Each structure stands twice: as C-alpha cells, then as structure tokens.
Amino acid sequence: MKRTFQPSVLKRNRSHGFRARMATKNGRQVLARRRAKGRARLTVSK
Amino acid sequence: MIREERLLKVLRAPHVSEKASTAMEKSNTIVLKVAKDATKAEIKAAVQKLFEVEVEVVNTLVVKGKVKRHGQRIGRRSDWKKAYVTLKEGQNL
Amino acid sequence: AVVKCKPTSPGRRHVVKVVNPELHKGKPFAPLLEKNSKSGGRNNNGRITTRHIGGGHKQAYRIVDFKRNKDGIPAVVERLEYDPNRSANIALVLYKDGERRYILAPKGLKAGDQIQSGVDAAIKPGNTLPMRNIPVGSTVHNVEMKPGKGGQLARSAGTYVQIVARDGAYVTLRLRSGEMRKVEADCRATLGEVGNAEHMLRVLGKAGAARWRGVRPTVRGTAMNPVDHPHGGGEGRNFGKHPVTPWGVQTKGKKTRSNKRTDKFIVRRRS
RNA sequence: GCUCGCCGGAAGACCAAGGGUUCCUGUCCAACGUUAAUCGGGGCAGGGUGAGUCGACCCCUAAGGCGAGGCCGAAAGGCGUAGUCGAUGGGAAACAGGUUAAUAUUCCUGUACUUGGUGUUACUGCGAAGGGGGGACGGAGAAGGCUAUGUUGGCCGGGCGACGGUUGUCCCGGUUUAAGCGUGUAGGCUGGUUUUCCAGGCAAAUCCGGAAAAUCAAGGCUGAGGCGUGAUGACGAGGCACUACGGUGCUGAAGCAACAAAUGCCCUGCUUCCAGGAAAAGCCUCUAAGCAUCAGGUAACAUCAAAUCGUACCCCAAACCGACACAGGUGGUCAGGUAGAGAAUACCAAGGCGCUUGAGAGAACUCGGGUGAAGGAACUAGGCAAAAUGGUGCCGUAACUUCGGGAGAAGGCACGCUGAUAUGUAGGUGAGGUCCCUCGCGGAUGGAGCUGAAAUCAGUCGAAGAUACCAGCUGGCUGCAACUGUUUAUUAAAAACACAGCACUGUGCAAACACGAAAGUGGACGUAUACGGUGUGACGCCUGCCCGGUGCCGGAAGGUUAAUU
RNA sequence: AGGACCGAACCGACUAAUGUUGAAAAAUUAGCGGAUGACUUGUGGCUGGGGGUGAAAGGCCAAUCAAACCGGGAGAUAGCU
Ligand SMILES: [K+]
Ligand SMILES: [K+]
Ligand SMILES: [K+]
Ligand SMILES: [Mg+2]
Ligand SMILES: [Mg+2]
Ligand SMILES: [Mg+2]
Ligand SMILES: [Mg+2]
Ligand SMILES: [Mg+2]
Ligand SMILES: [Mg+2]
Ligand SMILES: [Mg+2]
Ligand SMILES: [Mg+2]
Ligand SMILES: [Mg+2]
Ligand SMILES: [Mg+2]
Ligand SMILES: [Mg+2]
Ligand SMILES: [Mg+2]
Ligand SMILES: [Mg+2]
Ligand SMILES: [Mg+2]
Ligand SMILES: [Mg+2]
Ligand SMILES: [Mg+2]
Ligand SMILES: [Mg+2]
Ligand SMILES: [Mg+2]
Ligand SMILES: [Mg+2]
Ligand SMILES: [Mg+2]
Ligand SMILES: [Mg+2]
Ligand SMILES: [Mg+2]
Ligand SMILES: [Mg+2]
Ligand SMILES: [Mg+2]
Ligand SMILES: [Mg+2]
Ligand SMILES: [Mg+2]
Ligand SMILES: [Mg+2]
Ligand SMILES: [Mg+2]
Ligand SMILES: [Mg+2]
Ligand SMILES: [Mg+2]
Ligand SMILES: [Mg+2]
Ligand SMILES: [Mg+2]
Ligand SMILES: [Mg+2]
Ligand SMILES: [Mg+2]
Ligand SMILES: [Mg+2]
Ligand SMILES: [Mg+2]
Ligand SMILES: [Mg+2]
Ligand SMILES: [Mg+2]
Ligand SMILES: [Mg+2]
Ligand SMILES: [Mg+2]
Ligand SMILES: [Mg+2]
Ligand SMILES: [Mg+2]
Ligand SMILES: [Mg+2]
Ligand SMILES: [Mg+2]
Ligand SMILES: [Mg+2]
Ligand SMILES: [Mg+2]
Ligand SMILES: [Mg+2]
Ligand SMILES: [Mg+2]
Ligand SMILES: [Mg+2]
Ligand SMILES: [Mg+2]
Ligand SMILES: [Mg+2]
Ligand SMILES: [Mg+2]
Ligand SMILES: [Mg+2]
Ligand SMILES: [Mg+2]
C-alpha cells in the first residue's frame, strides 16, 4: 500500500529547508529555538 | 597566466593502482591526486611547468570519501579529485 | 440551425446542438489571441470564492473590440468565428487601413458586410454611434454605460436594448432584464441585436457536457449535515426552515441590491 | 559440472525518483542472515565513477512564489507594480567498434558534428529595452508509404549420428554493419515575381498588414524511407593456440534476396468534430536613437576555447516507501518464436531464477484442489459456495420500445486431418523485358519469382476436432433509481450523492455573492440567451384547494418608538 | 459518432474462502465493475484548523478528525476511582 512518506528532495528543501525557514519570522524563530536547544542539525538542508 | 604559486599547490600526489599503471603503460596517461578546486586548465599548466612534460588533455573526476567506523564511531573520509593526464606520446613521465 | 441527436446512447438521447455552418472552421486570428488560464473559482487567497467552477476545456482569449473607436474608417467582415469565452459569435473585420479587429457578431452580419463607427455612420446593423445620433426606438447592443468606456450592456447571444426615450443629456433604455435605465446620450451603441439567438435552444444532454464547460456539481444544502449548511440535517428528507444561502441569507425573494450611488440612473426596476 | 524445475509485456533489460558505496578484489565468520555457512547487500582493508556533443549548470518562460517604490493594515504583517525566480514544457552539437575485476555515446580506434572568441582576405549599411514573423500547440478517425523486426530461400562453414532410417525435398550454425555527408523520393502545404500607393503595427521601417496594376505560369517551403558513401574498414560461424581452467592471444568463410510487418516513422500531416485546443526565448526580419571610407554585418580560410558539477551500484526492489532480507506500493523506456484477434493465454528464446531451515512419516483435524453410485436445492436467511455456460461462421430470434433498442434475446447446424478442385485457388507483392519521357528515387505495359485466405467435393481417425490454456448460464414477474458517473481510505456502493432537464428567486456591473479589520481578489477580462442561491431530478401525462400561522415582497395614513435636544 | 459495446494494460473494490500474536496496523486467492472518459497518471504548485476541501459519507486534511499535530497557560479542574 502507498504509505505517507513519499520522498522528494526538492519538495523537502522547499518546504523545510534553511531558506524557507529564513523566509519568515516564524521560521526564524524555529531556527532560534533549535540553536538555543543546541541542535547539531538546524534544518533538513543538512 | 596562471601563477606559479597556484601551480605549485594543485598537484598533491601521484595515484598508485593497477588502473593507474595500466593507464600509464597503455595510453600514456598519468593518474594524480589534485586539489579539489583545481580546474583542468590549472592541472595542465601545472603538469607542464613542474614535470616538464607536454600534456595532451586532462580528464578529471571527484572521488567521494567513504563512511568508516573507528572503534565503532562513525566518520567520513574526505572527497578528493583525481586527474587523468594524457601526455603527448614521447614525454616519459 | 438546431439539430436533435439520435438516441444511439443514453448520453446522446437528449442532446440538442446549435450548429452554424457559417462559422470559420480553422484557427482564430493569432495577433488577437491571449492566454487565459483558469481560476477554479479561487481568489488570490487561494480560497474558493465562487463555488462550482473548475476543469473544462482549455480556452484562448480573443481580444474583442468593445469600444468600436476606429471612427470614420469602414471595415469589411472577413469571417464569423466561434468564441469559447462568450455565448455570442465574433466577427473578424478588416479596416481599410489594414488593421484587423474582432467584434461581437450581430444578427444578420455575414462575410462581406461593411461596418463603420462614428457620428457619421449609417443606421445599419453592425454600425456604432453615440446614442444621440441613433433614432428613438432603435434596437442596439453592446451599449456603453460611460462615454468611451466600451460596451457593457446587451452582449450575450441574441440580446439587445431598446432606446425608449431621449431627454437632454440622457437616453432611457429598456434593458433585456426589463429594467428602465438612464445612460448618457454620448455613450455608444451598436445597431441591431447580438447574433447567435439560437444559443439558448441547445440542450446539454449529459453531465459531462456541463463539466466540459467548467461547471462542477452543485450539492443541495438539504443533502448536507447541519454543520455544513443551514439546510443540513434530518432523519430522512426533512426541511422545515426558510430557504437560505449556505451563509444563512434568505434565498427566495429577499432583495440584495444595495447601491445608493447608482439608484438615480434606474427609472423602473426589472419587475 | 551434468540433469531437473520456474519466469519470460518478466521473476529479463535500461532509467527517472529515492537511496548512498550497497559496486569490484582480497580477507574474516564473533554479531547480523529466522537453520548451517567455507557464502552475503555482514566485518575489515584496498580499489573503482575519466564528457565541447549525455544530464545538471546555462538561455526561455507556465502554474505559482518573492517583490524596489506603491496601496493597505494596532504591531507583526497583507496585496501588488517594475522586476526577479520558478520545469513537469521551448532552446547548439557523436556515432559504430574495442577495452576494465569494477567506467564508458566519457578511455581507445575509426569516422563526424555544434557554438563562440580572436587573427587575416574579400564584399559591405550596421545598429534595440522597440515593430513584424516564427516558435506555437485540441479530441477522434482514416488510409497510404515506410522502417524496427520476423520468416523462408540462396550463400558460407560444419555434420552423416548411442536404437530402425538419414548424401537428402537431410541436420546445426552464421549470414551484422552507425552517426555524418551526398541524393530531395512516397507524400503535405503554398500560386510566384516586379513596381506604385496607403487613416494600421504607440516613433521608424526597405519588414508585416492593406490597395492597385503588369507579367509568369511553376517557383518555394517541408518530407519518412530507399540508394550511394562512410566501409580495400569493423564485426563475424568457426578453427588454432595456450591457459594462474576465470578466460585470454592469433586467424578468418559467407555476409545476399524475396515475402510478411508494427501501437514505432512520414504525421506539429490529412479528414472531421466541438468542448475550440500554453508562454517566452533561441531563430528570421525591420527600422529608431546613433555610428558613419571607423566600429559593425556577411563570407571563406586560420587559430584558440567549450569551464564546473553528476557519472560506481540497486532501481516493480533484500539497496526506494512499508519498524523486517516484509506475498503490499512505486512513473518512463525496450517488446523475439509457435499458436492466437491480442501487450489475453499456453509453451519457449535472449536473459534470469528454485523464493536462506532441512529430513522423515503418510493419524485425527485445518487449508488448497481432483473424482464420485442413486437422487438433484430435499441445503439454507439466501443456490452462500460449487457445478454449469463459454469460440468463430451461418440460420434464426417474442413481448415491449423513447424506434436507438430489447438482442449475443431464445435456439440450432458446421468445425480435426488428408487429397483434389487448383502439382497453390481468389487475392497480395513484384524481377527481368519492352515502350514513352517534361531524362530520374521517371511513367505505361509486362508479368517470372515470392506469399496466400476461404470454400466445395471425396476420403479418413477417435468416445469426443471452439479437444489444452482461454472462453456469456438462460428465461419469466415485480419494487427503487432515468441513464454513464460519485461515496462512508480501514465492517454500509445503495434506493444515498451527482446528473442533463425543470422551476422559483436574487443580480444593471464598482452586479448579486464569496475571501479579506483593509488594500484588494474571485465572480469575469463575463454583462440578464449572463452570473449566484435554492428546490426538484431523463422522458411521457401532469402538478388540484388554502395567504389564517411563519417568512419574503409592497405600502406609508394612523399609533408606538433611540440617540439627540 | 458515442460520459457506445466485448475485453488486457491501467483505475477500482461486489461476493466468498483464508488470514485475524497476519506474509500485510486492511492483504492474498478465485470470481467482480469501469476501461476515449464527469477517465487515469508523473512532476511541480495553491487552499491551514471553527479553518481548508468535500458528485455530501461528518468524508478527508501524513496509520490521528463532531474540530489535526507540536509547544505553552499547566501541577486546568477532578464533591470520583
Ligand atoms: K437528512
Ligand atoms: K440521517
Ligand atoms: K481546531
Ligand atoms: Mg577526451
Ligand atoms: Mg566529468
Ligand atoms: Mg452555482
Ligand atoms: Mg442544478
Ligand atoms: Mg448524510
Ligand atoms: Mg446551523
Ligand atoms: Mg421523515
Ligand atoms: Mg413535518
Ligand atoms: Mg558498507
Ligand atoms: Mg558484491
Ligand atoms: Mg559457527
Ligand atoms: Mg546463524
Ligand atoms: Mg560487504
Ligand atoms: Mg508570474
Ligand atoms: Mg507579494
Ligand atoms: Mg516595500
Ligand atoms: Mg528566469
Ligand atoms: Mg524539464
Ligand atoms: Mg556495470
Ligand atoms: Mg525491413
Ligand atoms: Mg494505442
Ligand atoms: Mg552505470
Ligand atoms: Mg527471504
Ligand atoms: Mg518486497
Ligand atoms: Mg503501476
Ligand atoms: Mg502472460
Ligand atoms: Mg493429507
Ligand atoms: Mg477438503
Ligand atoms: Mg467433482
Ligand atoms: Mg454424485
Ligand atoms: Mg451420476
Ligand atoms: Mg435434473
Ligand atoms: Mg427449502
Ligand atoms: Mg430445511
Ligand atoms: Mg455464486
Ligand atoms: Mg467454477
Ligand atoms: Mg413490494
Ligand atoms: Mg442509479
Ligand atoms: Mg454504475
Ligand atoms: Mg468502508
Ligand atoms: Mg464495501
Ligand atoms: Mg471587481
Ligand atoms: Mg431528490
Ligand atoms: Mg423522485
Ligand atoms: Mg464505454
Ligand atoms: Mg474509492
Ligand atoms: Mg483480485
Ligand atoms: Mg457496462
Ligand atoms: Mg469492458
Ligand atoms: Mg449521519
Ligand atoms: Mg488519516
Ligand atoms: Mg473544540
Ligand atoms: Mg493557570
Ligand atoms: Mg493533573
């Protein structure tokens, strides 16, 4: 059966990537929270 | 003109393997490890200046570093660039 | 002409089509073509703002001259054409200086007919003039509501407006709706009726024919649940409420015209 | 290694996406592998991905995104102009053979092609953020010409058979060859050329559009395939020679024809229909500012350049999505033989596999199947399940009907093989030859050779000839819904939803209405033969009475009545 | 010609059996419906939570839906166990 995760690198990067996060203030607050938690990987970009 | 300081940095080592030896003995091609940012033109000028041989053409490819485990800790070897440098038939390198 | 389809399949049994052999069989005039991509009834918020719109055949927009502004230069009708964007047919006309335009095709207009616009034009179908030059009692179409703005009234197939009276700077028109409307006498109108009056005689015949025109299905409010529509609910077919729109406004008789700015121009409502 | 078995419109092959070293070699067997493992997609070490032409990048735009100013909004922000991004689409160019343990349209051999930069020589009106052209576009259908490909014959090499026969009308194998360049063919479209004039193409135009005469009558554009060349080459059955028994080096025959033939090509064609079928750039052409024996354009020849990133391997799967080495899911391309209408189905080829526990036994019982005396729905909620029907041609077929249907109604007969008709028929294809020719890929006749249904008559074997696989059960009465569709992803597919059709009602355009504190946007680049809302639900015959209640519409006298004063 | 007919691919899901600590958190097997269309499919895009979308089942909106998910108010409150 077709499951929910159908990968596409382009769609992944456009939806959740570093530049999408940076594009809006709420995305930038996502990045601020992840930097303050100390995540080794801020976004799906890497 | 590409600088001598630039040319002295772009060739890192000869590459030693059976494919490299067969290339040298069959089609007059040397196999070199080169700087990852090196271009075919820089490689050509460097092999001509620093090995004093005439270069027909340079083919290049990027080698991806392998993921390895050291005492079951994950790391990754570096990527590097490999140059197939074809000489002009009488050059003796 | 109007032609019934033979009942060789249930989806054909009730089809009635309007077939016009005078319509150009080939491609439209390329220099007056523009892309018009579809909306699905969604606005710039991405939300459906008009229900029941979507799909249907791809269409190219034909630049139609609703202003009829090339005063004093006669044109000759080259060919009548099918226009997917409207119910009327259009006519490709060639102006004596070499310019081509599309116009709404009026009743009786055919290839080789001569048309003209301006105060000096003869009173014959296809000619356009300010309504101050058109006799009282004429039948016109493509009527301007403001001078120089372009035709806006009586543009659908077979429609027309009657100039009923002239009083000063204004003409009074009987609109196809039945409404009596004042319009500046400088506003222009084209003589005659819009053509393709058989348009309304056609019978689509099947659901798919509505879908080809971009018309998606209408679900009745009483077929829904109370959370979706005021009519929703019931164990079985129940109604017992005053009929309303999906947003709760009465929909059998309640008036919605609210425009104090243009009331002055209405002499008598459509009735 | 020999046998066996399974897939073969796949369980083969090549990819995209996704993954990321799983690829190859050596070595190890603790853990991982549902068993053992000497093996592995497992551990460890080393190796492996080579591009002017393939792809990305790049130029160009779609939906859409972002958006200088701007408009709007308590703030955050929303929308949007100029712009700028955004492929799933448009845009330059390479093929065949060989080679590695592992890459190849990338390396090598052979033979090509494209764009751009400079430098000569020659002829010159060049110039764009602009104008015009082109790019450039639907569904269905029909037919012709082709090729891929297959079959047979010829040819070439080999064979003479473990058991009766096999020098022949015998058996096995091979019979391949590209891009490029030349030729412009089947065929499609279009009249052509020269001058004059002009309210149009935001200005200009020699370009386009329009008008006028003169003149010629074929000019031009496009176009599969074939032929020639590429190629005195490559490959090539096989033979020989060694082999670390995995394979390597040498040598090299024939290498043709006829017939059949695509869903591929001509074909972005043609015909037809209505539901009327992207954009922009590259490209071509025209002028403006301007430059003006300069620059620059054209042409040939010469020289330089074409960077960078991807390229291993899986890819209907043990490598991707499903926690698994999981009977699931995953877009594109390739398409052999016999039989067959077929990409169904059976058996096979190329190729790939036997599904990572086995060995015995031959109880009940469960699962999946086969057969069954007599009976034949007695079973049961119900014929659930099962059994049965099943092909082609021809004969024949009722009520009812909206005249289309119903209908494959029902029902019945023939069907294999062999011989002749006719040593192979009707037909299809088509060489030599001849005749004409606006002389070539020409036309007219001519028909060798090849291929080849169906029928008739006679004979003949079996219990059975649509023999396997494959492949309608039929009829009678009646409810509901007109119909094809849609639906409760995962207990409901229906009589529910939708539907064409009908009706009421709103809406005069800055429309009603909807999203939105707003700007705006959709409705619609539509305009009452339109658009929204509501109910009904093809069609036929119809749709009666009630306005007292509630709603809506209209009224505007009188009473009551807010802020305010 | 056709929301025409029979029938593979393809899209579905009417019946039965199996399976129900499954091979599978919806499948398998034998049958079954559509199969030029209101068809189906790839890539990309838009609509966001009292919101979307809905040929309407309260269906669907990441195995979650009569108000998604994550974090917070938060140790809500719990005359109840
Ligand atoms: K109800
Ligand atoms: K109910
Ligand atoms: K909510
Ligand atoms: Mg090279
Ligand atoms: Mg490379
Ligand atoms: Mg509607
Ligand atoms: Mg309706
Ligand atoms: Mg309901
Ligand atoms: Mg309510
Ligand atoms: Mg009831
Ligand atoms: Mg009641
Ligand atoms: Mg590894
Ligand atoms: Mg391996
Ligand atoms: Mg052991
Ligand atoms: Mg083990
Ligand atoms: Mg390994
Ligand atoms: Mg845009
Ligand atoms: Mg914006
Ligand atoms: Mg701004
Ligand atoms: Mg761009
Ligand atoms: Mg693309
Ligand atoms: Mg390989
Ligand atoms: Mg052929
Ligand atoms: Mg086809
Ligand atoms: Mg590969
Ligand atoms: Mg297994
Ligand atoms: Mg699997
Ligand atoms: Mg599939
Ligand atoms: Mg099969
Ligand atoms: Mg047994
Ligand atoms: Mg049994
Ligand atoms: Mg039996
Ligand atoms: Mg029995
Ligand atoms: Mg019996
Ligand atoms: Mg019986
Ligand atoms: Mg009984
Ligand atoms: Mg009983
Ligand atoms: Mg049954
Ligand atoms: Mg059966
Ligand atoms: Mg009854
Ligand atoms: Mg029905
Ligand atoms: Mg149905
Ligand atoms: Mg269900
Ligand atoms: Mg069901
Ligand atoms: Mg508006
Ligand atoms: Mg109803
Ligand atoms: Mg009814
Ligand atoms: Mg059908
Ligand atoms: Mg479904
Ligand atoms: Mg099945
Ligand atoms: Mg059917
Ligand atoms: Mg069918
Ligand atoms: Mg309910
Ligand atoms: Mg869900
Ligand atoms: Mg709530
Ligand atoms: Mg609190
Ligand atoms: Mg608590």
From Swiss-Prot, chain A:
GO aspect biological process, one term: translation
Classification via InterPro entries: Ribosomal_bL34 (IPR000271), Ribosomal_bL34_CS (IPR020939)
Key words, A-Z: Ribonucleoprotein, Ribosomal protein
Gene Ontology CC: one annotated term: ribosome
Keyword set includes Lipoprotein: no
Highest taxon above the source species: Bacteria
PANTHER family found in the cross-reference section: LARGE RIBOSOMAL SUBUNIT PROTEIN BL34M, MITOCHONDRIAL RIBOSOMAL PROTEIN 34 FAMILY MEMBER
NCBIfam families: rpmH_bact (TIGR01030)
Annotated family: Belongs to the bacterial ribosomal protein bL34 family.
Protein name: Large ribosomal subunit protein bL34
Organism: Escherichia coli O45:K1 (strain S88 / ExPEC)
Gene, per the UniProt record: rpmH
Swiss-Prot record, chain C:
Composition-biased stretches (Low complexity): 38-47
Disulfide topology: none
GO terms (BP aspect): cytoplasmic translation; negative regulation of DNA-templated DNA replication initiation; ribosomal large subunit assembly
One cellular component (GO) term of this entry: cytosol
Segments of this protein annotated with the region Disordered: 27-52, 220-271
InterPro entries the UniProt entry points to: NA-bd_OB-fold (IPR012340), Rib_uL2_dom2 (IPR014722), Ribosomal_uL2 (IPR002171), Ribosomal_uL2_bac/org-type (IPR005880), Ribosomal_uL2_C (IPR022669), Ribosomal_uL2_CS (IPR022671), Ribosomal_uL2_dom3 (IPR014726), Ribosomal_uL2_RNA-bd_dom (IPR022666)
Coiled coil: none
Role this protein plays: One of the primary rRNA binding proteins. Located near the base of the L1 stalk, it is probably also mobile. Required for association of the 30S and 50S subunits to form the 70S ribosome, for tRNA binding and peptide bond formation. It has been suggested to have peptidyltransferase activity; this is highly controversial. In the E.coli 70S ribosome in the initiation state it has been modeled to make several contacts with the 16S rRNA (forming bridge B7b, PubMed:12809609); these contacts are broken in the model with bound EF-G.
Subunit structure as annotated in this protein's UniProt entry: Part of the 50S ribosomal subunit. Forms a bridge to the 30S subunit in the 70S ribosome, contacting the 16S rRNA. Interacts weakly with S6 in one of the 3.5 A resolved structures. In pull-down experiments interacts with CedA.
Note: This protein can be partially replaced in vivo by its H.marismortui (HmaL2) or human (L8, from the 60S cytoplasmic ribosome) homolog.
Protein name according to UniProt: Large ribosomal subunit protein uL2
Lineage, broadest ranks: Bacteria, Pseudomonadati, Pseudomonadota, Gammaproteobacteria, Enterobacterales
